[model samples]
Target chain A: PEPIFQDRWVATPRGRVFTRTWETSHLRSDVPIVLLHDSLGCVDLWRSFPAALCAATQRRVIAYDRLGFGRSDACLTPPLLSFIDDEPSTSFAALQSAFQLTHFIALGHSVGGCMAVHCAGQYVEQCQGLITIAAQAVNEPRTQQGIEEARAAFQMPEQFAKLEKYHGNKARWVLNGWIDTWLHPAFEHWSLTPALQHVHCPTLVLHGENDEYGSHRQPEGIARHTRGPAHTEILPGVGHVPHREVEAVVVHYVSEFIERL
Target chain B: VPTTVDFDTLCPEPIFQDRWVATPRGRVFTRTWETSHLRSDVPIVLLHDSLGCVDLWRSFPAALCAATQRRVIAYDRLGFGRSDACLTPPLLSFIDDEPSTSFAALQSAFQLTHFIALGHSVGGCMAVHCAGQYVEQCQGLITIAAQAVNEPRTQQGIEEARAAFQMPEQFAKLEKYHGNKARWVLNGWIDTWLHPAFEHWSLTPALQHVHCPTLVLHGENDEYGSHRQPEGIARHTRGPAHTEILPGVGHVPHREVEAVVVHYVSEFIERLTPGTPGAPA
Candidate 1:
């Protein structure tokens, strides 16, 4: 059966956060999957992935816009080096409270994947499992190279028009949120090691062999650092966005991972 | 047996003329509205708001030209409206540098022997600098909703604008004129004004240089600025200064009270002429 869907805004101290949910009665007892978007992404940018994930797993799915990125409020504070660390107590805690979510699974894409690892650590028991898609494990030089390449591409006015389509006038801030946060000199010691070690929930680390922002070492470090039963999958013929590159295959793998959980 | 009524200029329209003014740095888009009853005197050169352009002036220029019977000229500064794209961020000294750079290019391109300076918002500051640097040739000065100092109240308004523009639908209004360079224009206004270095910037020094008769107009309910800004412009300028604080208006009083604005502006500039009833002999 197709999942029923609705989107809304909930007030958080940080700002009003945009949230959407997809659910049906078939998996009433199953824990829901909450999505975290990338540095420049939002609930709308998730495209059709959440609905597919909900259908395949027979579970409810939810996604929220982090303040400053999408439909949420402009960030009240600068997204400095500790932004990844601050997510749990800030946006995630607000998300957890607004929905009365007692227990759920965390799934995030790219930078969002790094944030999901922190979510597990932030709520050790309530977080049943974790799924990371094309997530970086540490600040890699190759990742910096990808950002440099993208930085050059963004010099064109056309490149920013795409950002403007999703983020509106916040397009400049959204671009800065991605490029500046990653490329800042202050981000020298940036790593997900501490957060990964704290994640004891059953974990699934998925990456693409050709992922431009990361290499195989990212999935390897993620799997090695986790304290739970973990599986690392390197999707063939794909890059950073594996879910979008090959949705059916990614869904099958995530369904299999959840069935085991 | 008379020539056609020429109702367009007399009523809803003006004689429109547009061209690209070339410069050493880049090109600027300029347009003019000449009413049928054209004056042989100096034209009004308009400097748009931080986010504004020639077209963003909308109907105000036409109304002003009709009321005053003088040509009104407006332009798109570099990296704004129909102008060229900017490759880098604007320098912190951009506001101070505008007159000798872009405005000089504009003046030379048109051979503007004599003119009046009219500006809105940050553009108002530029007009102050314009009337000062070109004191001998600039006949008059007019500013609307202009900031005289870097006030926290004004900065908060910019901060709020940044937040409000997060909605795509709301952002489209800005995109209508800026096209692809909207981001650059936004940052040119936001990041530049909000800079820590700009906090101490003031117009007091520039005000003393302007020798032209000045009209400093503002709103009573201005959410972005205080009457202190207009008062400063009036108090400091070396001229016969006129200050008006309109009730029930905000940052854009001209838009809210167009005909009334045209009437007052007509009277003020007409007084500068030789033959009008209240004019100097």
Candidate 2:
């Protein structure tokens, strides 16, 4: 029987606890792909993609709800960019430490996608490869509108109540602001364009053709920024969440990329 | 080989039972409980959460079988895994029929006269119920991270579930919350588990009704938050009821700490099972 996707909790220094679920069918590994969820995304929202990815890649994959999402402990304070990066990388690191992770890939989606790049950048020696979906190396003019829409979505009181019901008592702010930073006032001038050069490990960038937040141009722009051997895939007829919308394609790309690396 | 014994050596292929239900279009069908180990002294029956399947338990079943020198049985319940699809005949609420004849059919098929009942998550509730109803055939019970309280398990939820499973027209209404893969599985589950009448469910009365010893294990930092749920189970058992809280573990402790889970389970069986007690390793 195919294993079902489920949620679990683990304690972390960022707080005493975090939430994650295992999907090993798509992939199997002693050391697995530490999956990162998008901003405001939880383990449940990832649906069956983690399991699908595990099955295809034959690697262990874990999907975690961020500090304020799903079943994780409430955030003690709003996260910093560092904490946001830690939300995925450090949580993965802690889980790795607890579970004895010695080598693995970093796979991130959306905000998680950016963080996967951030993790590979920060811990180049530890990571085997990197796969980023809808990641923004640079948040540009066209992307700003989506960021604003995300900002406004957080302000709706009714949604916050709905979130609280499902996400647990710890979901603090009705909305979060990280999406705005994609098009931060200074972001136009701000750049990791150079940092991309340092991501020497093999990399794969995936984004949706119809992603509300960015264009295929963003991933193309990323392709130009990196110095390493990299591949790019722009899924057709999909939105910001390619993993959820076209999971089979996304999991195939990830598995193939990891296998090649 | 005489010096060593392992579950893999005793059993590898699983035992399965499938039944065909008459349907308008064709035979609606599903498989039943499977015994993993062949020739062993004690047999452990396995149950899992709403989302779990046989493959999910992975090597733990083998490990436990090896450690205890026992056979293990695990199966996919109705509407889960390779089992029959819920939409066959379109009964009002397939999950609510309760007193599942399938379990008995599987037991007879496996020739399993007596075995220990072990379960996790929602399976834990089923374990407690089975332990009570099948007291003449069961030896003991082991449950992890299960709820004993009634409020979380309701009857209104069950009726809604019946509608979802029996009617394809309602699939979209149900899909919004659980997506495609999870809709049928969860609808039957949520209805059987969350309806208000489900509040009337008390594994406590069943726990008290049970004749065998009981072991209740839960994670300290469970996502549901450790409270009335575990307490309720501990309070009601008729036999020697023991409780243990594992640290740095959560709802899926079996996966997160397989060695620990195997060790605890083996040790508990050691203390309780008849004359062939093995020392804790």
Candidate 3:
């Protein structure tokens, strides 16, 4: 059965957040899965992945653009430390109040994956589980090299024009937000270890074997440091995005993980 | 009886064919517009503005073809429209290389034997460059609001453009035409022209070499350049030249007042030669 969809906006103290939801044919009693997009990503960038995931799990799914991205209001100022620092509390509160979601699974991609770990730690009682896809646990030399490569491309006009389709006027903010935050010396000690220590929920860590952003050590460290039962999967021939690059395999593995829980 | 091609019979509707031509720089995106009939002997090639593409010409290309009874070609440069992206930033001497790159693409794609080159803004300068280099193949040259010399006013206009781009809305509009190539498009227009090494950039060298009949149309109120630009080109060109200063129009004449431009252009081509398509009997 196909999922029903709706688009809406939630007004929080921070700003107006644009959101979308997919309600599966068979609504389960378990908590819904909330998706967090990548640094440069938005709800539109996800395309059909959210709906596919909802149908695969027969559970409701929600995805939204944080402030200064997509249709949401502007951030105006530089982000604090990392965007992940603001997401766990702000995103959770917004979702919880908007849909009355008392308990749910948090699924994040790339930078969003790091935020999911923090949410799982802070809301251990409400968060049923955690899923981090192609997420970074620490800033490795490989990460720096990858960022440098991206900087070179951004200097060209084509990629920035691509960013404008989703971001409109906020394109520059999104680009600088990602590059500056990651490259800043102030964020040198940034790690997921502290957040992973507090996460007691069952965790599923999935990463691509050839991810440009991080090495296998990222997912391995995440799985090893978690307090609860943890599993790690390294997808072969896939890059940074598992849900997008290997949709069928990701849906299969994720559904299996959800069923066991 | 004066035999005149009825503008209505020339083309009931614009016929556009889009294709890509491979070049040393990269693949260039081109659109060929023609009437129900093609002259084959004489064609018109369009060069777009600093930020313009095939689409940016809007209905002007189609209208020009109807008025002149000649096939028209418009294209997006390597870094501009649907063309492939540039691997690296361009240097100051890049404009000098545009003639070869554009001519190569023009030859490979359309196989045109003899043609008239019409260009707007930066494209206008490029057309003159092409005419100077390939005088035998290029029959005539038409430039609209082209910069003859980079003056202080041009620098002021570029600075204003830079400021507007910072507001996001300015670039947002450019995004529709440029796609992911917006940043490169802006940089290509601003960086190359504003660079100190390119300060002495003038079209006099190319104009001096252009021996074909020339048409120079400029806006009286053009922001980037003064009326002295067209005056300078008319005074320097070795060929028989005609210049028209469009009153109350800005940098874009074809866009600002289409009927006036089409009328003047139609008359200009009619006076050229008997074999030229759409010439007055």
Candidate 4:
């Protein structure tokens, strides 16, 4: 059976971040799973994946729109190169405080995957486990080229039209926030090595065999560098968004991993 | 006008905020006295009486939060308070339906983990039902002036209540909280409890499912019921149970004797679960 979706807004020091919770019938865990969105993503962009995952795993799931995206309040300032670094302390802390969540499974996609890793590293006490989908381990030239291609794709007015449906008036800021940070030279030397070393919890690193944005190197690096036990899976003929592109395979693996824990 | 260690100054007064949360039945109007420093443990969820709403709780909810230093929440049932009006006339089985509606709102709106359930009058019955249904989420249960069994004395109280509700002044006082839904609230409180099908209603079946520690407080001079109410709850509960019948107090001890009620409740919590924040000095 599908889980029902409930909408809410979490109040943070910066602004209000929109959130949606998926409640399942057969709850398997005491802790809820928290979902982090991609750089260009929000709760809406996750589509039906949150509900599907909750039903498959039999665990309650929470997905939220970060500031400046979806129905959440706009970011008060343009994001800094270090904006991603502050998520563990600011947005995530506010989320924990507002929801009274003591422990949870952290799952992320794209740059959200990077944020999830950093969170698991910093807050090892609260984060029971980590799962990263199509996450980048290091800033490589291919990543830059992928961002450039995305920048070009958004150049067409039609792309912004789609983004605008989710981001409203902040669509332009959302686009610039994604393009400016990753493409900037100051952010070029960023790597997940320091963050991965601090992660002492078990991790599941997932990527696609034919991912356009990243190759096996990303998932391999995450699995290799983590101080704790790690599992890696590269789906056959899957794309960047494995959860969306190959839904059943990703759901099956995630459900099995959670059930084991 | 202040003295040594003014506790009020040390304790932060929670600001009550009004919000609407969707439930399976309808939209439930809720108000939360959110404390700035949230407790790591479960929060305190307050369920109101049949004729009650967020406004009717008055200053008691805030006082409880101030005393315990825990996040305290109160919400109106679907037919009462500022929530959506009752679409279908309620049946005797409606008591069985409340736990799910309230639990859904608690999960979706507040995202609460484990929490204590505090209920008054008929709301206390619902709290027991919630503990039975959501066994994992409810850590403790407290019932004040709760109905444990339907008896002749209980019907007599409802009969008198119906008469009072018909009085213009009494209805006016109720209207202050219920607005246009006053009639609905009055009927929900009077008719359902007095209905013939509800005569066999008892908390014993639900009490069997409750595994958490239970606290039952009843007024010695309660107009609605006798000590048999809390006695039945304590006698039948599966977990450790404590029963209190406050002398010289009426049905609403929390309102009539705020300090005494708070003291007893706070002490019970401290003794039952040591190391809880705001333990009595």
Candidate 5:
């Protein structure tokens, strides 16, 4: 059965974060999956992955555009390096409180994967399962190069307008907040290992074998460093956006991970 | 400030300490092996190869410090290992510019007094420049696989290495040592050397400034350069210089022949005058 979608706004110190939840016709009592967008992602960018996930799991699927992304309120400043490290207690805290989200399955893509790892760690008792797709464990070489290439491409007005189409007029802030935080010299030392180890929930690590943004070792690190019983899958021929490129496979794996939990 | 925990160490025993020193340019990682054999004399400072880091140095720095009974310091320059990345790509003049920047920062942060400079590959070139730039304080120099001239083999070898990195798996391996900044490290190296602006670049002018005793070591079979590289390094330096071409060796003489390299460096620095302990105060 198809799931129905509804949108909501939640508070953060900076501004409101945009959130969307897919409600299944036969919603199970099981915890819902909370989706975190990647550096440049937002609720709308998720397309139908959340609905598919919601239907497959027979549970709610929730996703939010962090401040400065998508329909969310604008950011007054570029995000700090601590944005990844601080997500669970700050933006997610408000979301959790506003939606009364007590228990959840944390799932994310790219840097979203990084945020999910931290969420799972911070909300260990409430987060039943953690899934990271094409996520990073540490700031790495290929990831940096990929961003540099992406940065070069966005310099074109044609390529950049796509961001504005989704992110509104100040899409400039969205781009820099993501790129500069990663490319910043100080953020180079940031690693998800510490947070990954804190996650006591069942975990699944997924990456496209051809993920241009990061390498296979990223999945390996996320799976290996976690305190939970963990599983990893490398979807061959898939690129960075696994949920988009191979939606069925991702949904299947994500549902499977939730089932085992 | 980078969270001040010590960085990782692979060398067993001696309990090495890892630190990041803040400079105006950003932080660079350093590991110090302070041994009982540590002399009041000049400590040996290590400069790694273009793709190298403190971890990539493996057990060599600790081994060298233990053997020489003098302190050893190895650093990952900006854009390598645990160090910070440079906002810009790289100035073509980095080879000549290193001493006054990162090395100079290390000197102030560590309060380094008299020191011996040791480097491998392009790191060797940087060491030569350091010895030249800090003529008064640099007491000794050792360069392995150091290229004094931009020879044909040098350019060809670099190009081949760059090509090899086109494979995802090979590049994946590099992220282990240089997380976050390996591509930056690679581009700085590849683009700089291959630039037409650097076509005539050589350490000749820098080598002329090194006044300390020098040891030039090269693997006879090293793919990057011919014996002429070592010969040129030995010939142009004002200091008394010794050149050795080890048989059955390649680019990484330190790794290919660790014990010999450690002993050779130890014996060379050992021959130099040990620093007299400060005024017996």
Candidate 6:
């Protein structure tokens, strides 16, 4: 299965970009499975779940780090201020096109969920369904705290000194910095909620109890506002990355959702 | 009074391949000017706004031709002007959908190489779409009073504009309020735009993906809005874009303050973007 994982660069208006993949051993159906990594996570960060989920659902699963994450990180450049505006949909469009996927079901965690919502909205005809894991629709008080803490990382000399851990590797440096920037106070106001109302595609919202980063209410908020068919699954004794904490249960739920699609 | 244009000579070509070029899902219409004396480069494409007829652009082609010394061509979109009656329901209330014609196909079919696009209003959005999705082919882009965000209330308002569309009664009232085709265009506009769904639309998201050098123009006194819309777009993903707000005009300051808009557009093309041949404003 590891050998089946293909790596490719998706050409976008910005430039050449990268995507990672895992093959589900089943026949290709009208609905493929594409995975988007959580904020601060890369394709490998999904651990073995992408491959396992692909096997269970028998659909193609593709995941990619934003330019600053994973392999794309080395080649990643400072983002032009406006690039982030088109980031969610434009990048997804480029990925889906490069993969030759006309229609697919998508699974995303954290910020990746925001991207999924956009793809479902702007490219309505193409997306088959959505799975949002620990995703937040609107910014909450916790987001505000996260942003301030992350931005402070930019100003701290001790933090930059910690770059020694990666030996100033550009990809790792930026990946950590991106998370810092995203959680910066200014970013707390960046809301995808306005866009979520237009998501006519069916969706699944999942979150874990006792999560350290954020609360399950975030997931509940998105499910309530989303326009299409939706279901919420709450996992107990789990933290932020439930798929990693409780792999089998997560896979079972995702498989059930894929079957419905 | 001698008008600015001669209608008899307006037809640069006698026939259009797809008569219904502008209507929903209709074949996009096109006209081409070969590289000739004065202008040795590929001809530029001009995409006009809603309800616009090719005939209405009486002086624009002549001005562009004189400045660039290149052949200029313009055509009506399927539904408006003289192209054809819209047989299909508008594919979208605000978003232009399935027109047998799309700008992408039009450029390819015409075999026009390296084109600079000029668009207004709805046409502006299409140009932005083409630039982001088709950057390799687009040399430069110019949008006048381009709309980036969809305000659904605008679409919902259109549903109630039936009374304003009746010719005489509407015409007299429109003349009293604002006498011109723009009045009728705006009157019909509220129906075609403004709806709950429009809130979700924003060309800004697409603007960030456009890789080409771009220019945005707006009227300072625009009754609908102001420079905030265009100014917000300066930091587009490709590069910092240029924007200008003309004083003393409404939505289409280009038509009203022709000299200023023309100067800005021409300067932007020649001075800013690469591949543009120097031409008079």
Which residue runs does candidate 6 get wrong by more than 4 Å? Answer: A1-3, A28-30, A73-77, A80-85, A146-168, A171-186, B1-281
**lDDT tens digits, residue span B1-281, model 6:** 00001111222421223232332345444454332233336455667765454555546655565445445556555554544344444544333431125554556556656667777767777777766666676667888777776543334334455455566875565444323444445544543455444556677777887877788887777655446566655555474477777778776665687777767766766664345464223
TM-score of 4: 0.49
Tens-digit lDDT track of model 3 for B80-199:
877888867776766667777755676657777788888899888888888888878888888899888888998999989999998788889989998888888888888898899768
Evaluated on the second chain alone, the candidates' TM-scores are 0.93, 0.71, 0.91, 0.89, 0.91, 0.72
> Going through the candidates in order, what fraction of the true interface contacts does each contain?
0.00, 0.00, 0.00, 0.00, 0.00, 0.00
> Which regions of candidate 3 are displaced past 4 Å?
A1-261, B1-12, B274-281
Can you list the residue pairs that collide in candidate 4? none
- Winner on TM-score (1 vs 3): 1
Candidate 2: stretches off by over 4 Å: A4-8, A21-28, A81-90, A154-158, A172-174, A179-188, B1-281
Q: Could you say which candidate leads in lDDT?
A: 5
The DockQ-derived docking category for candidate 6 is incorrect
TM-scores for all predictions: 0.50, 0.45, 0.49, 0.49, 0.49, 0.43
True contacts kept of 4: 0.00
**Model 1: per-residue Cα lDDT at residue A117:** 96
Candidate 3 residue B223 C-alpha distance from true site, Å: 1.0
lDDT of 6: 0.62
Model 1 alpha-carbon drift over 4 Å, by segment? A1-261, B1-13, B274-281
| CAPRI tier for the interface of model 3 | incorrect
lDDT of 1 by residue, A1-261 (tens): 778888877777868888899987688456889999887788877777788988898888989988787788887456777778888887878888888788999999989999999999988979999999989898888888887877676667877676777788887887777778899898766778889999989999999766777887799989989988899898754567766666788899998888887
Q: What's the CA error at residue B171 for candidate 4, in Å?
A: 1.5
**Model 4, docking class:** incorrect
Winner on TM-score (3 vs 6): 3
Model 2 lDDT, residue A221, Cα: 68
Worst 10 residues of 2 chain B by lDDT: B1-10
Task: List the per-model TM-score of the A chain.
Answer: 0.96, 0.85, 0.96, 0.97, 0.97, 0.83
All DockQ scores: 0.00, 0.01, 0.00, 0.01, 0.01, 0.00
Best by TM-score: 1
